[PDB]
Each structure stands twice: as C-alpha cells, then as structure tokens.
Amino acid sequence: VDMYIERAGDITWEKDAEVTGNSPRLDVALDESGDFSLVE
Amino acid sequence: TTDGVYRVMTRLGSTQVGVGVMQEGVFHTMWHVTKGAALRSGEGRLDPYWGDVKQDLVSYCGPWKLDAAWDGLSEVQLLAVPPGERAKNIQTLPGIFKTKDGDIGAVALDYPAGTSGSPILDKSGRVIGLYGNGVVIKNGSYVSAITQGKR
Ligand SMILES: NCC[C@@H]1CCCC1(F)F
C-alpha cells in the first residue's frame, strides 16, 4: 500500500473566501482513543 | 519538502485519504489519516518522528512545529483540500468544545473525509490546527475540533 503526498497549494489567507458555518458551544469529553463525545 | 499544503494519497487506482502541512521541513497530519505509516514524496521517503493517538496527530521528519492558537474571538479560514478539487479557503467563526481540561475552538464545517488534515488558519496565515477530528450534533451535522499540537 503506497501512501504518497502531492503538493496542493501555499498556506495563505484569502481575502475573497466564501464565508459559512455556525459557531456552536458544545460540552464534550475526549477519551483515550482520541474520540470526542458529547456530554450532558 | 517545500512549505505548503499537501494531499495524502494511497494506492489499482488512487484515492485521497487526507491532507497535511509541510512547514520547517516537517510534515504534519492527523494520525487517523496515515496511522503513522511512512510516506513517499517523489523518490524520497518521509519517516514518522512523533505521534499521539489521543491528540490524533503525527509528524514526519522532525518534531511538531505548529504552535499558533485561535484567539477565541476572530474568524478563521479552513484551507480545505477536498479530493478532486483545488485547494480553497472557507472562512468561519469557530464555536467551542468545552472540556474538563479547557476549551478548544471548533468549526461547524462538513467536508469529505479525505479533507482530514486540512489546516485551519488565523488572519496572519499561521496554522492554528488541523481539521478532521470531531463530533456529530443533531441532523448529522459534523463539527471539527481545531486540533493543534505542542511545539
Ligand atoms: N509507524 C509507527 C508509528 C509511530 C510510532 C508511534 C508514533 C508514530 F506514529 F510516529
């Protein structure tokens, strides 16, 4: 299984970016396997 | 070895399994993308150097170099590199993961799995973390932590 990388761009901020998405505030826990889960 | 954002590909045909960041000679991606396997870059090989399953992060060729953090107030940009698509910037105001150990920025953006490892940027262009470890809220909406390592 060949895993390989290809360059896709510079790391830059773009002044003309599409803007979208909410900003939810969530209670979460992070377990030993790196998995986030919701908490109540 | 050039600074930049990179696709992580696997092989019949090829498939994009994720994305990563080259900075200061070190390649940064998420553990779940590569599981720590070595990577080919042209005719050269990149060997894993550090990784941690709980943080879901791995670095190649040297220690983790990215250390900028979300300022908690400002919009950020996901520099998404989806499979089959040109790198593109998506601007958003992060929400928050509140945890017993402190708060983590989170972006409520849902891109294909092969986008995991895409960098999230602050206004100065610094990588404040990587996209693709997160949680699902209601109606199948995914929310990604802004996952940053330690330099
Ligand atoms: N291919 C082995 C993976 C290594 C050992 C644990 C950390 C690491 F991901 F770099």
Numbering used by the authors:
A (entry chain A): 49 to 88
B (entry chain B): 18 to 28, 31 to 170
Original paper wording:
The protein construct contains the soluble part of the membrane bound NS2B co-factor and the protease domain of the NS3 protease/helicase protein of the Zika virus. The NS2B–NS3 Zika protease is a heterodimer, the NS2B co-factor wraps around the NS3 protease domain and forms part of S2 and S3 pocket. For soaking of the NS2B–NS3 Zika protease crystals 40 μl of soaking solution containing 0.1 M sodium acetate pH 4.6, 0.2 M ammonium sulfate, 24% (w/v) PEG 2000 and 5% (v/v) DMSO was added to the reservoir. 0.4 μl of soaking buffer was added onto each dried fragment and incubated overnight with one crystal. For the second fragment screening campaign LigandFit and PanDDA were used to identify binding events. With this campaign 18 fragments were identified as crystallographic binders with a total of 22 binding events.
Here, we present two crystallographic fragment screening campaigns using a 96 fragment sub-selection of the European Fragment Screening Library (EFSL) provided by EU-OPENSCREEN. The performance of this subset was validated in two fragment screening campaigns using the model system endothiapepsin (EP) and the NS2B–NS3 protease complex of the Zika virus. EP is an aspartic protease with the catalytic dyad formed by Asp35 and Asp219 and has served as a model protein for finding inhibitors for other aspartic proteases like β-secretase, a key target for treating Alzheimer's disease. As a second and real-life target, we addressed the NS2B–NS3 Zika protease which is crucial for the viral life cycle of the Zika virus but with its shallow active site challenging to target.
